[PDB]
From a paper:
Upon attachment to their target membranes, Rab GTPases act as molecular switches that are activated by a GEF that catalyzes the exchange of the bound guanosine-5′-diphosphate (GDP) for the more abundant guanosine-5′-triphosphate (GTP). Once active, the GTP-bound Rab can interact with specific effector proteins which mediate a variety of downstream functions including binding to cargoes, enabling vesicle formation and promoting vesicle fusion to target membranes. Rabs are inactivated by GAPs that promote the hydrolysis of GTP to GDP and the inactive Rab is then relocalized to the cytosol. Structural analysis of Rab8A revealed that the PINK1-regulated Ser111 site lies within a short stretch of amino acids within the C-terminal region termed the RabSF3 motif.
To understand the mechanism by which Ser111 phosphorylation impacts on its interactions with its GEF, GAP and LRRK2, we solved the structure of pSer111-Rab8A. Phosphorylated Rab8A exhibits a typical small GTPase fold with highly flexible Switch regions in the GDP-bound form, and well-defined structured Switch regions in the GppNHp-bound form. The superimposed structures of pSer111-Rab8A and WT-Rab8A showed that the phosphorylation at Ser111 does not impact the overall structure of Rab8A. Consistent with this possibility, the Rab8A:Rabin8 structure has recently been analyzed using molecular dynamics simulation revealing a salt-bridge interaction between residue Asp187 of Rabin8 with Arg79 that lies within the Switch II domain of Rab8A. This is consistent with the observation that an intramolecular H-bond is created by the presence of the phosphate at Ser111 with the side chain of Arg79. Ser111 is located opposite a negative surface patch of Rabin8 in proximity to Asp187. Thus addition of a negative charge at Ser111 either by S111E or pSer111 disrupts the interaction between Asp187 of Rabin8 and Arg79 of the Rab8A. Strikingly, we found that the ability of LRRK2 [G2019S] to phosphorylate pSer111-Rab8A:GDP was disrupted (compared with WT-Rab8A:GDP) and a similar reduction was determined for pSer111-Rab8A:GppNHp (compared with WT-Rab8A:GppNHp).
Residue numbers in the entry: 5 to 178
The structure:
């Protein structure tokens, strides 16, 4: 590895944070060959500008011990994926509360991206792509609609976030 990026997945329970992680890291969706129970992080190494970037992606937003989130939770975090479910408007409304939680407790500056997950389920869509784009735009954050199930824009999301982290990091130094 040339770079090591600590990414966090945050968002309401049931939006598909764990499925996004295991789709990206294992190319699996609710498979029997994996256990997604009590997995705090997954590692995937990608290539940007010919360099090996090791992504340590954390999925700890759901579990009890971090239902009260403190400054300690976001320590070392270089990227955050804010995940909502396009079929659940309540999960989308709570993205503002998750952003406030980052703005208040994150000590260091961090690259952020909003994922509208479950974009394969169009018939149940409660949040238009336009409303997701307008929210992300209001906060100066990047936006994608993903599907952990259909494998839509999962690689694209993590490669785009990693690119934005690397670009910031490379500019600081040269
Ligand atoms: N249709 C569809 N279902 C999904 C997708 N991602 C996750 N799910 C389902 O949504 C539920 C919640 O997923 P999970 O990863 O446990 O959400 P988490 O609580 O944020 O970790 C599960 O039953 C998944 O099968 C997706 O992209 N499309
Ligand atoms: Mg989960």
């Amino acid at each position: 590895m040339d770079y090591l990026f600590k990414l966090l997945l945050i968002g309401d329970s049931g939006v598909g944070k764990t499925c996004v992680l295991f789709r990206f890291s294992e190319d699996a969706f609710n498979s029997t060959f994996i256990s997604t129970i009590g997995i705090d992080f997954k590692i995937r190494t990608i290539e940007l500008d010919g360099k090996r970037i090791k992504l340590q992606i954390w999925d700890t937003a759901g579990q009890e011990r971090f239902r009260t989130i403190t400054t300690a939770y976001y320590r070392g975090a270089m990227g955050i994926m804010l995940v909502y479910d396009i079929t659940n408007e309540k999960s989308f409304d709570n993205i503002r509360n998750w952003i406030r939680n980052i703005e208040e407790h994150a000590s260091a500056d961090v690259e952020k991206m909003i994922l509208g997950n479950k974009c394969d389920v169009n018939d149940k869509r409660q949040v238009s792509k336009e409303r997701g784009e307008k929210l992300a735009l209001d906060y100066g954050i990047k936006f994608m609609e993903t599907s952990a199930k259909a494998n839509i824009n999962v690689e694209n999301a993590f490669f785009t976030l990693a690119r934005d982290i690397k670009a910031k990091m490379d500019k600081k130094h040269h």
